[PDB]
Amino acid sequence: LTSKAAYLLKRNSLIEEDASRKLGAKIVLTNEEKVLDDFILAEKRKLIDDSRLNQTEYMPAASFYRSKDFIDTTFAYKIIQDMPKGGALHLHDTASARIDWIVSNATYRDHVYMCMDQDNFVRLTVSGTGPPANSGCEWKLVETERANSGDIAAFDHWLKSNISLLTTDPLVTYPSLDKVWGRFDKHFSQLRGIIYHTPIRRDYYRQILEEFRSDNVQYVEVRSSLSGFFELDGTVHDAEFGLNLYKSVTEEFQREYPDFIGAKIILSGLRFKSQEEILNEVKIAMDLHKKYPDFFLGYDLVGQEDPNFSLLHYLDALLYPSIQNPPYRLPYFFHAAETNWQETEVDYNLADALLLNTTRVGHGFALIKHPRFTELAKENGVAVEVNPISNQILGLVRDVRNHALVPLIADDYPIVISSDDPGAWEASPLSHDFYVALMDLCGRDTALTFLKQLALNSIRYSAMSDTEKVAAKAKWTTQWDKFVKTSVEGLKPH
Amino acid sequence: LTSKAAYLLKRNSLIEEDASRKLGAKIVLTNEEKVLDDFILAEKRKLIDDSRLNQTEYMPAASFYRSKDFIDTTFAYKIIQDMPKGGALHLHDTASARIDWIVSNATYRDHVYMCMDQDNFVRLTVSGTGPPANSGCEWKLVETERANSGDIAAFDHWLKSNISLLTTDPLVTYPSLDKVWGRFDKHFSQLRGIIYHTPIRRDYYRQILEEFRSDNVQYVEVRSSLSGFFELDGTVHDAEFGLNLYKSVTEEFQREYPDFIGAKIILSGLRFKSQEEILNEVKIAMDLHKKYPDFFLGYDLVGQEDPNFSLLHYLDALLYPSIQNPPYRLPYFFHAAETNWQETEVDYNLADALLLNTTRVGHGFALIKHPRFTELAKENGVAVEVNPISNQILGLVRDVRNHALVPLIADDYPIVISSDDPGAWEASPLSHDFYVALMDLCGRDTALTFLKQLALNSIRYSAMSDTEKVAAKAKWTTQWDKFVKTSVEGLKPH
């Protein structure tokens, strides 16, 4: 043995020790799985080596506006499309389906009005008793404008363009945190008036289920405000009504597609409402969790985190369930530390989130900056929902390889991958975020064990009961074996 | 007590446990030091809270081209200028002094020629025996063109402008890794011909000591190729000549300024040379370390890391000292993992860097992505040299708050702060990098304990002997006490 050879053995041991601690390093692959892993690794290495050695841009790490088409022209992305990714655990209902369906289906119904608002954005609303009661905008019947356009396709494309966040590059058109959050909030107010109409809302939820199933996702946990669904006559429904609407649509979908696992609902409130309102919503969530223990999961506070209220500001509301006699455990799913800041109100939300026994943490972008918080969350088994494309578009990081959670992936932290609002910025339900995770959030030697671990984590860290987890894993295993067999036989020689 | 009061006690305990683990958390401040700490924290909190709550840009995290003037108009920057920061441990000699001195002093000497190359960049060289022998460029004598300008200040300002990296915003003008590294290499090649002329090189090194002393830095460790210094007659000197030139200038400076601590030299070679040449340089470094054991520190490899050779490619050279009989310990100061890549050749340099017993690691941007490497290096006491402004300008991260080493700082990792090439992009010797470290690399509750720990680390992790470290800390303690007492008397009422 040479002194050089002893050095090489020590280097091999050290590199093996470091690489054995990443997410999915304990996954064992079959020979067919290894066929798929080599297929994926080959294209990933081609891209990395071309970018590094030829000193050219690494497209998977660029802005989603610029890389989306490139991603759609790769073989690995088709592989990821076909892969059963398990469950999407972090979704917002009003942005989880295509704008395309809102344009081609919803704005063709009667009593749908459009207008151009003070900021030169299109607003859509439904009014059954004549034009909308807000005359500050000049409301037109959508059918009349579509007819007078002379080109229905051009009209529909302009409508989709005036609603989407991906019509231009957000990193160029809205190049600050404030500007992109302005565009994002404007999107939600553009669709508020039409997407809360009960028939449209029900059909939209069905569209969510269909699109996620067709993208080979079998389970979704959705955040929803759940109340305010309205009728043509002005009747406005409560949170229990929305919950049951979703529940029956879900049960119908399940009977129609036995391969599907299901869907569950988390109630969401807004980070800028009064404490009285948030306490009301917490009591409502208590009643909903009591009465629908198997469909309703818990409560969350959403909206932009930097300029709005902290969790500590709502402590009296969030502590209300626990001060009962006997105490009530209302599960929480807090968004926390979606921020670049350090030792401020926003990232110290993490402290509150762990002390309130949160089931999962959304984003957790500043978690890596808090060693004790990271240890405590790992000890408690608190998984982090990661939405890479979301974090890029909403101004947390430019290069996805700079994502704050990459080190935590490399040290086997419990995480899941999701798309926050895929419909708002035209991403596939889960395939685009999985491709970005594969290309940016792990290294040159990691392809399939990582993705398979993500799929497994989305079941293990779901809010399902243990019986439900066992059944869900069985359904997902059936699909995964089907996918492996089909992809290998389409790729390997006979 | 109350469920709310018990919650608040547990929250306080958890938050202070998290915060007690950061760099400098064990620093005890005197009352005067606390005056300065409150002064700095007040401005820092004003900026952070203004940016967060008024939803405006956080200037300290913007591109250095845009924030430098803003920094120069802050009170905290004056405090940081006056603070004795200890030692600058990571510098490159040809970019450690102002371009202004090259323009106003070096290009006023005889036999200095200028030309415009094919990419419209000015090249400066010295030729004593007639115009330069390269006919690919059309060389003009600098004195005549300066005379024909008619506005000497305008000519000299254009000359500095054609050389600096901060004349335009690098993040805009060279918006990729390849583009900015092309500009950086071009900068060094612009000055190659004039800065290796022996009289100019000696005076330039003297200027380095003067500028770093005036920025209240008492100790510098400089990386240098040390060879190739030439005379007007064509004579080219070896590495020992450069070493002794530097040594005599340093000793003269020390005699003239007893408050100064001193300077030491690390030999640097380029990451794209043959294994044979790098082995020669290792032999030269071995001889220099044997013969000048207190002025010469060791060896390093420099140049852009992504497209050039790995440390493993040079293993035979780098292992040569240890296979001697008896084995020779040649200290190493490797640049390592200055990269966004993961599980590639570039970041696995860290493994080799650690197995070669490196004293410190330059940049180490990918270290956090390797949990075992981070543990091993922390155990071995291997400090990481952090150069925030350099890492922003050379394309590793855009928002300084996303810098990969912020978490390691938050967990008390041994690190030092330096400026890589402060002269190339018009930064102060060390104050600007300290300001950025204060404003971006630590949280809202950290000002002075962090800076004081950085200063102490630059002595603890210097390559000085133990006796030298004791003397250096005494000298620095004198300066620090003077600085504190003077600043407090200038800020507090009588």
Ligand SMILES: *[C@@H]1O[C@H](CO)[C@@H](O[C@@H]2O[C@H](CO)[C@@H](O[C@@H]3O[C@H](CO[C@H]4O[C@H](CO)[C@@H](O)[C@H](O)[C@@H]4O)[C@@H](O)[C@H](O)[C@@H]3O)[C@H](O)[C@H]2NC(C)=O)[C@H](O)[C@H]1NC(C)=O
């Ligand atoms: C988050 O989760 C926490 C951990 O589950 C929750 O704290 C738990 O809250 C329950 C219900 O309020 C408490 O259970 C009660 O405990 C006491 C007896 O406990 C101790 O009593 C003495 C004092 O040390 C000691 O002699 C005993 O051996 C016990 O150690 C009784 O009053 C009740 O019968 C009841 O069982 C738990 O004590 C408490 N656990 C912890 C670890 O604090 C917390 O409420 C959750 N927070 C939120 C916001 O949901």
Ligand SMILES: *[C@@H]1O[C@H](CO)[C@@H](O[C@@H]2O[C@H](CO)[C@@H](O[C@@H]3O[C@H](CO[C@H]4O[C@H](CO)[C@@H](O)[C@H](O)[C@@H]4O)[C@@H](O)[C@H](O)[C@@H]3O)[C@H](O)[C@H]2NC(C)=O)[C@H](O)[C@H]1NC(C)=O
């Ligand atoms: C980086 O630093 C490392 C630690 O300082 C260096 O490794 C050291 O290398 C030296 C020189 O080759 C070794 O010293 C020799 O050691 C052996 C005896 O060592 C062991 O022998 C048996 C084997 O297990 C065991 O029973 C003994 O107890 C000893 O532990 C003898 O041949 C000589 O007397 C001589 O002292 C060190 O042992 C070795 N240290 C370690 C921890 O491995 C390394 O070479 C440096 N690398 C570079 C590139 O500079």
Ligand SMILES: O=P(O)(O)OC[C@H]1O[C@@H](n2cnc3c2N=CNC[C@H]3O)C[C@@H]1O
């Ligand atoms: O109309 P709704 O109340 O059903 O939803 C609309 C509201 O959702 C919020 N939201 C949706 N995706 C997210 C949200 N907030 C915080 N972090 C990022 C992301 O996770 C904001 C919007 O105003």
Ligand SMILES: O=P(O)(O)OC[C@H]1O[C@@H](n2cnc3c2N=CNC[C@H]3O)C[C@@H]1O
């Ligand atoms: O040898 P010279 O002094 O004539 O040229 C100086 C040479 O140093 C290298 N360098 C200078 N600053 C750095 C360098 N390398 C890599 N990381 C970033 C930074 O730390 C490249 C240059 O060509």
Ligand SMILES: *[C@@H]1O[C@H](CO)[C@@H](O)[C@H](O)[C@H]1NC(C)=O
């Ligand atoms: C770099 O580009 C050339 C084409 O000019 C190609 O042959 C080569 O494979 C590329 N390098 C890598 C590592 O892909």
Ligand SMILES: *[C@@H]1O[C@H](CO)[C@@H](O)[C@H](O)[C@H]1NC(C)=O
């Ligand atoms: C929209 O979809 C529903 C089913 O959800 C369908 O019945 C209806 O015909 C569609 N509407 C339009 C206008 O295409």
Ligand SMILES: *[C@@H]1O[C@H](CO)[C@@H](O)[C@H](O)[C@H]1NC(C)=O
């Ligand atoms: C929306 O449409 C108006 C009118 O056509 C146009 O001027 C404007 O730029 C569009 N806005 C967006 C955000 O696409």
Ligand SMILES: *[C@@H]1O[C@H](CO)[C@@H](O)[C@H](O)[C@H]1NC(C)=O
């Ligand atoms: C926001 O700006 C106003 C000036 O319009 C200033 O008075 C206020 O203090 C700022 N907010 C913060 C938190 O500094």
Ligand SMILES: *[C@@H]1O[C@H](CO)[C@@H](O)[C@H](O)[C@H]1NC(C)=O
């Ligand atoms: C250098 O000067 C020329 C004109 O004198 C100008 O066109 C060129 O852009 C300048 N280059 C830089 C890098 O400043």
Ligand SMILES: *[C@@H]1O[C@H](CO)[C@@H](O)[C@H](O)[C@H]1NC(C)=O
């Ligand atoms: C340049 O500076 C050196 C000392 O650093 C000094 O001796 C010399 O006179 C200066 N040269 C010019 C041309 O000003």
Ligand SMILES: [Zn+2]
């Ligand atoms: Zn979300």
Ligand SMILES: [Zn+2]
């Ligand atoms: Zn350097």
